[PDB]
Amino acid sequence: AEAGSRLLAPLKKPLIVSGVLQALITLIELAPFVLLVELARLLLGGAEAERLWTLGLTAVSLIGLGAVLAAAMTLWLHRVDARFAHELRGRLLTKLSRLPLGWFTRRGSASTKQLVQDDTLALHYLITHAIPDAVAAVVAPVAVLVYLFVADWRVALVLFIPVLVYLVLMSVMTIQSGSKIAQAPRWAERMGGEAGAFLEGQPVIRIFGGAAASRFRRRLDDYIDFLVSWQRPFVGKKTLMDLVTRPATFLWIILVAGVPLVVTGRMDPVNLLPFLLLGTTFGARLLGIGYGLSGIQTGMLAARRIQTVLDEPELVVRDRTRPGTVELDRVSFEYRPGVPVIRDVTLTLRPGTVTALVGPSGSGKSTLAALVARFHDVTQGAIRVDGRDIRTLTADELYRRVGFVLQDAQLVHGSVAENIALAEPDAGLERIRTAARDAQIHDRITRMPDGYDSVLGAGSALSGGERQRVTIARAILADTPVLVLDQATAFADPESEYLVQQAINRLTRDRTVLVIAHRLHTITHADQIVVLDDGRIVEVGTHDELLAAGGRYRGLWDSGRY
Amino acid sequence: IRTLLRLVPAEKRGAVAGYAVLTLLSVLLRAVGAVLLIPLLAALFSDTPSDAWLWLGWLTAVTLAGWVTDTNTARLGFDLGFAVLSRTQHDMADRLPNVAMSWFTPDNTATARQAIAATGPELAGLVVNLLTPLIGAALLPAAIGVALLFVSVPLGLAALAGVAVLFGALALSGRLSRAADKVAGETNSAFTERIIEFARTQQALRAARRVEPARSQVGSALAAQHGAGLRLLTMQIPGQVLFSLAGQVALIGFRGMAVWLTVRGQLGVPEAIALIVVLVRYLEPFAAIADLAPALETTRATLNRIQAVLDAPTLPAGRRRLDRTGAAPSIEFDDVRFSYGDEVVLDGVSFTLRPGNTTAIVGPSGSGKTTILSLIAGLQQPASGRVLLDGVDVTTLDPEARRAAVSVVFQHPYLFDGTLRDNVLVGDPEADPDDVTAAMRLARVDELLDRLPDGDATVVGEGGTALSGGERQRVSIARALLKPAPVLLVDQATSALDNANEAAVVDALTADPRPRTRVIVAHRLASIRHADRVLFVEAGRVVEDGAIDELLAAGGRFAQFWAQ
């Protein structure tokens, strides 16, 4: 695989060294059995006690030496291939912060968990154990069978019968499970998706459908059907391989052809000593690749799947390369190919002016804020902050110049202080409190059990109108020259909405503000009201001018009073 | 293991008993298979090798019987492995909807998500991969050890002592890495939680410049995960080499004893050579146990998380069916009190709502007016007092009858990853297509079908993230209107809707065909138009109530509420 081999290229030299050292280790491990054959052959000859003991000691030391060298490789090779995962996982988290957010919405948090954590974990066998198991599974059976074939070819061929049978089981097991292993990561993502949706959308599951009718139960039963149909012949072949390559199976097969040769005048019993001691040793090494070839397939797919993400197009910062000004110049954007969401929008936001972006729901007013944030790149046109294109501005220079409220109270799992101080985590606790008071949420937070240190994860959340005020306080603390309020105070009552509106007007007197609102009664004081219908700006002007013009804004205003 | 056996289905315990017999039979045949070699080889190297034919016969018979048992023990081990898996995962899936909402703390949701995430094949083979080699290698090396007492007592006693030290070494390996594997699991679990947050709240993090690994919270989770990951290997591999080496030290030791007894004349040379060969059967079972320490701890961890979910506090319930099965029930509170942890939400809240009429709830944010709709729907339950649906206490209602008596439009509308029509159909999957279009048409979802390319097949993202804020709100409204329940709870269903769609939706909510008892929460006066009754809640208590016109004329807090 071009993408699979390209990912694991840095581990070329460590893996080649692992293969060579395993060749030496496997020969060191077979060495004491050859000495035991000589020691056993000396017992028949009745040699002196000292002669037998020297073969015993040099066999014990080689057992110790082989174990030291074997443990030196595995300890080294796991550290090398655990640092690779940390390097690889750091690359993914760096990659994901640069992709457009269309990537995140079409995959979700369940597939990103699969990528960063599960897929990088699936590489573990492919690098730590694949080459040691592949080299030991060929060095030792070939080394033994070459030794035993010189000893006696008759019993060597008999011992070779289970070798061929094991290869047949290994091949049919691998090809049959090949199709299922390809489908396995897909099911894990989908099952991971339902588990996230089932646990997150619990109020929906409880009231609508309940436990029985939930889609999680349906797909859970479907997944276990996949595992049963996958793991049934897989485990069925794995047990047969374990029986064929068991030490007792070789020892029986040796004696099936050994006893008739010893009983008849066709083999001296001394020539069985190599088989009884060496013939059974390589059963557990052949089994290493039988159980591994499935683990290589998951690793190679995971490497292919990881490298594909690392080759995704990014939000590249161009090399091309008034304060507080944002300009949209014939912007046009499409979330999907051939589905225009924004069409030829031209809009200039100047300092000290509050621009009010209104219109029908689903018109495109939130995606315009997304384009300004550069969560997505405009398909046409350009967006320029202070004369610098957002595509030329780096992430720091862009998000230090523009601050956002995103219509969703996306609170992080952390203290109340940290959710307010997400922009600048080293913000002083007094600065956090002043931001919270401006959002009219300091009084709420003081009443919580732990104050500003209280955790705001799932099951310890706030009310819907208060989790939004936390994000308003976050934006206030960030305090960028350009602010983009995507329907802040949607869930706020009139009293709190008016108070936070007064606070924001106090804060952003000499700043650019793009306020998005469906409550038009708070929009009447905007310097310019921009009406966005079907992604195109259909009319621009002040409140009185729009009412006099009598268009879509007049329709919305009349329908507002009901 | 005691937690493991109880998770089996009651019907499957017959296979559990059969599995134990074949597991004892398999070990007994394997030990007997090793015993039959000593007469065989000792006869083979003797002057009359023809005696080997008899002892070869019993070895082949025991060997074939060993293969038959081992294949069948795998089939029962496979069946028991998935019987536990399918039973536990179905029990967890059926248990979580009934578990109390307060149980889902950020840590508990992590274990519940991890416990659900253990559905893969690693836990499916908890019997075949882990128990069978473990039990086979706990009884067989001792079975060979006791069998050697009838050939040489010093060698047979050494074999039994070998099992003692080898298992003792395994215990020390587990005790050493138990602390490190506790930290490894927690830091590996926290990394999963932060990846979910990283990909779920990406918009908030990016605007906050909190996405680089050098400053992100997932970056710290990865760094902590790596440190605990390496620290586990440092305290784990020395455990495995000591066990693996001690296994080889024990084997060569006994092969040394067999030689040494031969030198002293206590053991014949043919019998000594037979014992040297057969003693590989002593280390064969212990070889499998060497690498199962990581598997044993992971399997122990998952079964603890599974049992944690099955120990979760199920919500209280009864078996009373709703009296007004068809008609509109009369919702009422009787000194209903409620509190999240320590903070008091409701204190002395008592109101009675007539059947079939529409009632509005208004008040400052944080008042507790989403909690009122939660208690009526049964998502929450009072600490004291009782909610009555037509004189029937909700706590005593059958949970099947409890959910069928309420439909809710949640404040933060959540949709599942799937087509637009699928999310509308979860309200009533048995509904006729005419009823689905009627609900979508009423909730103004037909506007989305006209605009969107796919119509009612647009693949919504996780939540409603592949739809606008008002598009997922109208899909939520259509979902609730489709459900035929005689109670409709509306929790700010017009927040993210323009004046054009808000006015139309408000008409649909208050003028749908069938009768219902409608409770409405909203922060916009146009969203509670022509409502029969109002409930103003400020401090968690209903300050005042009545008609809209009466309250406006009265000039109380309701009049000041919309003054601005």
Ligand SMILES: Nc1ncnc2c1ncn2[C@@H]1O[C@H](COP(=O)(O)OP(=O)(O)OP(=O)(O)O)[C@@H](O)[C@H]1O
């Ligand atoms: N899961 C929770 N854990 C702890 N406290 C909570 C939880 N949910 C809500 N609260 C607290 O309950 C009180 C009332 O919450 P509730 O959701 O009922 O508010 P609400 O009146 O509907 O407000 P909003 O206008 O913001 O929607 C608030 O103080 C909120 O902090």
Ligand SMILES: Nc1ncnc2c1ncn2[C@@H]1O[C@H](COP(=O)(O)OP(=O)(O)OP(=O)(O)O)[C@@H](O)[C@H]1O
């Ligand atoms: N991730 C996405 N993939 C595809 N289409 C999307 C995605 N996000 C939004 N859309 C589409 O973009 C169009 C406009 O969405 P947007 O979020 O800009 O709405 P909006 O005008 O802000 O609405 P509202 O006032 O209800 O919040 C909608 O038709 C929605 O279907």
Ligand SMILES: [Mg+2]
């Ligand atoms: Mg929007």
Ligand SMILES: [Mg+2]
């Ligand atoms: Mg609420």
